[PDB]
Design a protein around this nucleic acid. Structure first.
Lengths: 99, 102, 46, 70
RNA sequence: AAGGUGAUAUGAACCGUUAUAACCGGCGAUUUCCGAAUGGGGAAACCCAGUGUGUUUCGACACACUAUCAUUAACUGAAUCCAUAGGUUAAUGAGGCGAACCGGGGGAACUGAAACAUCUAAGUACCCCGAGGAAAAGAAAUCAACCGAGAUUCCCCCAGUAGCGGCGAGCGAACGGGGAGCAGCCCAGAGCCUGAAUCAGUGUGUGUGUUAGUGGAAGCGUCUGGAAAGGCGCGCGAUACAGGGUGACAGCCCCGUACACAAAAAUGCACAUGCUGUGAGCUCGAUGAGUAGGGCGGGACACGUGGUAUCCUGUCUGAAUAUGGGGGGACCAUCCUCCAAGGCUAAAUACUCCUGACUGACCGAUAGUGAACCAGUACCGUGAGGGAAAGGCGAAAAGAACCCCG
RNA sequence: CGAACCGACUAAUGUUGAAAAAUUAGCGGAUGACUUGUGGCUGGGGGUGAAAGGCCAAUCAAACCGGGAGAUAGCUGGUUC
RNA sequence: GGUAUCAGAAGUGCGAAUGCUGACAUAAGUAACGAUAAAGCGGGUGAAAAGCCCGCUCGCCGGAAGACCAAGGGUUCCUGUCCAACGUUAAUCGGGGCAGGGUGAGUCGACCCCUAAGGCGAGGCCGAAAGGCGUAGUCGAUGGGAAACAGGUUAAUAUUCC
RNA sequence: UCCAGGAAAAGCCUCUAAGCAUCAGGUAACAUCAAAUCGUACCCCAAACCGACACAGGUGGUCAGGUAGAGAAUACCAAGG
C-alpha cells in the first residue's frame, strides 16, 4: 500500500469518556488518543489494517491540558488529539475485548 | 564498599542491642542493613483508605550504619580487610585477618 | 480613561520584542547579554 | 576611502586653533577614474593623488598586478 | 560488581548474584523542531515548493539535495570579430557562538586646575574589527663616547631624578647597573652539486600526563549514660595521627590514609619515525624610490613648537644609490656607530568561562555569590531592564495505631 | 436644531476618592480643518507640534534602561567601650 | 562544644544619620464594606441560611443592565466534590481548591493565491568599522479571489455531530 | 449632480509567442476519487480584556419587537438579563 508513512502507531488508547456508548446511533465511532500528528487519512487507514473495521469518516481535534504543579509554583500543560472516526453498522465489535 | 552480601551473618556493634546475633540483612550498595537484631516495636496507621485499613505495628527495620560486628567467625569483628586472588573473575572476596578466604 | 497599554500580539514583533531581535547588531546583542549573562528562562515570544 | 593603488587615509585628528580645539578632522585624498591600459582597455580605478603619481614611475600594469593578485 | 530500575514518594511490574543486571571510563549508533539556520517565506520551535529515492494494495510517506559569498575547474557567453561582462555546474572553504588577556580602527564627560578656555581626567569609559593560546615585539639605518655594549620581552634599580607644564595643577624619561630568558634566519638568483638540514600537515611508535580503577595497616575490657569514639586498665599499627563518617570527642568500626600497582581504547606535550610539500650546501652575485629628505596641517615621542632632535603621517613635492646613505636632541665641521625603505621567529611576560588536587589568624542564613532551598525563579516593566523573600524535628520516622470533644 | 459619536465652558461632590482627573446636573461640535478600527513611518539635543515648551507609555527647559560611577558636594546629617 | 595564660590580628563595642531589613505597637474595635434598581414570605439542604437551590410575590434594565463577534484573555466552560486561604460579612455558594469531563468542518476563519502603507533586499551605489540606500525580487491586510442551508441533539460542541 | 475629480495585484474572460504538430491540451455532460493542516470551550461595553481590586472609568463592529413619538430622544413594556 502506500503504508509508507507511519501507519505503525498513528492510533492508540481508547477514551471510555462520557461520550462513550452515548455516541452510538447508526454507527459506533471511536475516540482514540491518536498521536498529536496523525492527520485524518492516516487515521482512516490505521483502523483499516488493524481493528479490521470499515471506517466511513474521521474528524479529530486537539484538547489541551494545563495545570500548575511544582516544587513551589510553575506547572504546565500536556496536550493531546481526540479522534471520533465513524465506522458503519453491519459490523459490530465482533470478536474483541471491549474496555 | 560494603561487600557484606545477603545471608551474611553479622553481629551487632556500636550500641543499643549489641552483642546480638542477626544474619542475612538486606544491605545494598549505598543502601540499608536490616540484619535481624535491630528493631523496636513501631506502628502503621490505616494509610489505605479502603476496606483493608490495616496497620503494621509489628516488625520493621532499624537501619544503623554498616559499621556492625564484621561477619565474625570465632569471636567477633575480625575485619575482612584483605583481598584474595586468582579466584573467581568478577570478585575474589577474602576474609578476617585470622585465616584466608571463607 | 485610556490607560497607556492596549495589547496586540501581531504588534509585538518587528515593531517590538519577539524574534525581530535577530536583525540588528544591538538586537542580537540583547539576546547574549540577556540569556548568557545571568541565564534567563526568558520568554519574549508567546 | 580608496586610492586603491596606495592605502588611503581617513584617519582622524584634532584640529587645534589658537591653543586648542578638541574637535576632530578626517576624510582626505580624492578620486578619479578611467585609466587606459596598454592592453585591452580601461577599468576605472578610483585612485587619488600619491596614487595617480604612483602609476607613473611605476607602470599601469604592476600598478594593477596587485589589485588582482592579492 | 552483588545488587539494581536518576530525584522529590513509595508502590507496581520487574532485571540481576560467575563472568554482559546494574554502575564508572573510552570509541561509536541514534539525535524531532527552532536557532549562523543554509530550498523560499515567517510574529523563533510554524507555513509552502522544486528536483531525485526506496517499500509501494505501487496516488503516497517521509527521506535526500537545492542559501550567500570567495578560490579554482570546465562548460556556456552581450552590446562589438575577437575578448571580456554575465550565466551554469562542481570540489573545497567561510558564516555563528565565545569570560578574560592581546593587536588594531573610532573615542567621551563628570573630575581636577579650590572659577575656566591651554592643560586634566585618559587614550580611561565605551563601541567596532581581528587573532592566538598567548598575542605583540624581535636580530640595529640601536646605543655609547674615542672604552665599549650588542634582537624583542618581563622583574628590581637609576628617580619622583632629567626634563615637560596657564613652568599652574600636574605629566614624568633615559644612559647606565642587578636579573628572568636566551637562537637567530629567509626572498630580493643563477650555476654546480643536487630530494641533504629546517619547518608544516598527516599514519605510527616510545616516554610521560588526562580520561574508569586496585591493594592498603593495628583494640579488647570494664564505668556512666538512650546511645561510647569519652573515663580507667592494659594492648598493638604507624613511609598511614589529612580529613570525613558512625546514636557524646575514634590511629586500631567504615571511607579513606603513606606507600605500591594498574589502560581496549581515546587524546596533551615531548622525542622518534614514514608520507607529502619545503629546501640544505658551495661558488659568484644581487642589496628593498614616489622611498629618504622637504613645504603646509596634525598626531606620537615624559617633551604643551619651544632653540626641539627623532617616529607616523592627511596634503603637495622629491635625491644619492656603498670612495654612498642614516644617526649621535636646533645647526656646522671632525670623529665614532649603523645600513632604513621586504618577511618569518621559541622563551622568559598576560588572562580565566573551565579542569583536578590542595590551602585559608575568609563568612557562617540581614553574613558569604543576587541565588546554601526548582533563583536570574516569583514578582515588576511595552520593552531594554530591574530583581526577591526563603536553612535546621530526631540517632532512628520510631512522623503519633487506637480512644474522646468536634 | 438635535441623539449616537467627538469634545470639555460652569457648579456641587469627591480630595486616606468608586476614580493617580471621575461622578451628577447643565455645556460646545455633530457632512466635517469631522470621527474611529487595524497596521505602518518619524528616536532624544532627536522626533512631532493650528505653538502650550505642548506630546514622545501616570516621566519632558532635553525620555527610559545600563554603563563611566563610589561623578563632584568648601553643604546638611550621623559617627558606637 | 569552649578555652586560664602571655602574645598576635581585627568586618572590634550604636541611640539617633526623614539610617537599611524584619517583627510588633498607636490611632481603634474607630472609618469603611464600591453607585439610593431597596426587597417580603414559605419550603429544601445543612452544624448553622438575610445572601445557596425550589416556589409565589415585588422592584430594575430593555439602542439595553439583552444577544452575537472581533481585540485581548488562556480553562474562567460543564459535572462532582471540599470551604483553610480567596470572596471587603455568613457561606452549604463562586470566575476559589482537587478531581474528572468538554470544544468533531471540502463549504465559517487561518493557512493559501493577490497585492497597499511599509519592510526586507542577489548583484549594485555609498560609508573609518558598525552600517545607510536600493534594482530584480521577496514579505506585508486593515483590502480583492470558490463553495451550505433548515430542523434536531449534548451536562457542556454545532453553517463542524444526525 | 458636484469639485476637492476619487488603491493596487491576482483570480476571471480573451488574444496571440516560443513550443506542440493523427498527440498533448481546450470546452461541456456526467462517473468517481480528493479537498490536507491549524482554530473552534467560556468572558467579550466586562467579575475572564486595559486600569494593582469581584475598581461607579476605557474598549471596535453586528442585531434592532409593542404603545406613544419627528426619532437609534424619552417613558412604560416584549424576548431576555
Amino acid at each position: 500500500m502506500i503504508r509508507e508513512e507511519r501507519l505503525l502507531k498513528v492510533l492508540r488508547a481508547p477514551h471510555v469518556s462520557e461520550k462513550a456508548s452515548t455516541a452510538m446511533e447508526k454507527s459506533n465511532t471511536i475516540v482514540l488518543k491518536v498521536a498529536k500528528d496523525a492527520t485524518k487519512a492516516e487515521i482512516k487507514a490505521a483502523v483499516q489494517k488493524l481493528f479490521e473495521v470499515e471506517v466511513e469518516v474521521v474528524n479529530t481535534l486537539v484538547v489541551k491540558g494545563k495545570v500548575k504543579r511544582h516544587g513551589q509554583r510553575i506547572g504546565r500543560r500536556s496536550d493531546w488529539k481526540k479522534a471520533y472516526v465513524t465506522l458503519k453498522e453491519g459490523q459490530n465489535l465482533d470478536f474483541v475485548g471491549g474496555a | 564498599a560494603a561487600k557484606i552480601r545477603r545471608d551474611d551473618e553479622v553481629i551487632v556493634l556500636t550500641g543499643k542491642d549489641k552483642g546480638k546475633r542477626g544474619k542475612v540483612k538486606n544491605v545494598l550498595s549505598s543502601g540499608k542493613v536490616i540484619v535481624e537484631g535491630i528493631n523496636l516495636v513501631k506502628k502503621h496507621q490505616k494509610p489505605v483508605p479502603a476496606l483493608n485499613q490495616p496497620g503494621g505495628i509489628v516488625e520493621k527495620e532499624a537501619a544503623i550504619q554498616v559499621s556492625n560486628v564484621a561477619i565474625f567467625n570465632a569471636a567477633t569483628g575480625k575485619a575482612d580487610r584483605v583481598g584474595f586472588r586468582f579466584e573467581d573473575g568478577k570478585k575474589v572476596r577474602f576474609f578476617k585477618s585470622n585465616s584466608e578466604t571463607i | 480613561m485610556k490607560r497607556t497599554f492596549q495589547p496586540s500580539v501581531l504588534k509585538r514583533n518587528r515593531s517590538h520584542g519577539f524574534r525581530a531581535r535577530m536583525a540588528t547588531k544591538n538586537g542580537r546583542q540583547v539576546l547574549a547579554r540577556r540569556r548568557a549573562k545571568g541565564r534567563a528562562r526568558l520568554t519574549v515570544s508567546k | 576611502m580608496k586610492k586603491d593603488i596606495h592605502p588611503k587615509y581617513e584617519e582622524i585628528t584634532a584640529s587645534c586653533s589658537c591653543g586648542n580645539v578638541m574637535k576632530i578632522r578626517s576624510t582626505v585624498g580624492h578620486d578619479l577614474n578611467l585609466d587606459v591600459c596598454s592592453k585591452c582597455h580601461p577599468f576605472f580605478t578610483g585612485k587619488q593623488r600619491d596614487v595617480a603619481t604612483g602609476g607613473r614611475v611605476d607602470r599601469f600594469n604592476k600598478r594593477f598586478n596587485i589589485p588582482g593578485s592579492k
